Design a protein around this ligand. Sequence first.
Ligand code: B12
Ligand code: CL
Ligand code: CL
Length: 274
Amino acid sequence: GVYTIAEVEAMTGLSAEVLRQWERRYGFPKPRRTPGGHRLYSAEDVEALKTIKRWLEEGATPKAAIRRYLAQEVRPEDLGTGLLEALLRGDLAGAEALFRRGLRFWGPEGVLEHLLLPVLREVGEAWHRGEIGVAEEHLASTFLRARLQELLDLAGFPPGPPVLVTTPPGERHEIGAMLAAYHLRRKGVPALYLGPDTPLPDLRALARRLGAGAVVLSAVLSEPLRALPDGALKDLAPRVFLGGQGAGPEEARRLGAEYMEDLKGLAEALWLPR
Ligand code: B12
Ligand SMILES: [Cl-]
Ligand SMILES: [Cl-]
C-alpha cells in the first residue's frame, strides 16, 4: 500500500516541506503522483524515513543520513549484490549511490571488474531464468552502460584517430565489447564505445564522420554473423577487427574482417599505423 504526504508527516515527524525538499535535493524519497499531482509514498519509503528520522535525532545530517540508507552501510564485498538488487527494484538513486561508494573503494578498472560487469552478467542470467521482464533488464542495462562510459573517461582518452567499438546488428551481448573498449584505452588506444546493435550503414557513416582508423566488433553469437552478406564488413573502416566466442577466422575472412582471439593482440595491432 501507499500513503499521502499528510499521512507520512504524521507517521515520521518530518514536515511536508522537508519531504518535498529531500526529493528535490537528494532524489529520495521518490513518490509517484496521482492525477491531481499529489504524492503517494510506498510503505518501504515510510519505514525508510522513520529510520532516517531516528538517525537525525541521534545527530546525523540529512544528506549523509539518506546516503547511509541508500548505500553507505553496505560492505565492499557486497557492493555488487547491493547494486543488482537496487536496479531490479527500480531504485536508481540507490543504485547511483552504490556506484559512487564503489568508486570510493576502487579505481575505474576495479569498479568495472567488481561492480559493473558482474552485475550486468547477473542481470542477464536472471532474465534467462525468466525472473525479470525486458523492461527491468533494459532499465538495468541502460544504467550500467551509462556508468561504463563514465569509467572509460576516468581511464583517460588518448590522442589520435578514434576506434569505434560495438557489436554486429542483432547482437545484444555487449560485455565483451565493454571489456574491449576499456582494455584499449588502458593500452593507449582512443576507443569510443557506441553500445551494441549498430546498423552497418550507421556505423560506416559514423566512422567516416569521426575519421576513425579502425572498427572493433564483438560477436558472442555466431548467428548474427552468418546472417550478414559476404564482405558486409569490408568498407566500414580502414581496418575492421572481429572477435569473441561467436567469431572465427573463416567467418571473418568471408566477411572482410581480421580475426583477433585475445585483447592483447588486438591492442598490439591497433598500435600499427596501417
Ligand atoms: C548476459 C546475457 C544476456 C543479456 C545481455 C546483456 C548485455 N547487455 O550484454 C541479455 C539478457 C540481453 C541476453 C539476451 C539473450 N541471450 Co543471452 N546470455 C547472457 C549470459 C548470461 C552471459 C553472456 C556474457 O556476458 N558473456 C561474456 C562474453 C561476452 O565475454 P567474455 O567471454 O568474458 O569474453 C572474453 C573473450 O571472448 C574476449 N572477447 C570478447 N569480445 C571480444 C572482441 C574482440 C575484438 C576480441 C579480440 C576479443 C573479445 O574478451 C574476453 C576476454 O576474457 C549468457 C550465458 C553464459 N553464462 O554465458 C547468455 C547467452 C550468451 N545468451 C544466449 C542467447 C541465445 C540469448 C538471446 C539472443 C536469445 C534468448 N532469449 O535466449 C537473447 C536476446 C534477447 C533479445 N533479442 O533482446 C545464449 C547463447 C547461445 C548460443 N547460440 O551461443 C546464452 C549462452 C544463454 C543460453 N541459452 O545458454 N543475454
Ligand atoms: Cl504532494
Ligand atoms: Cl554536500
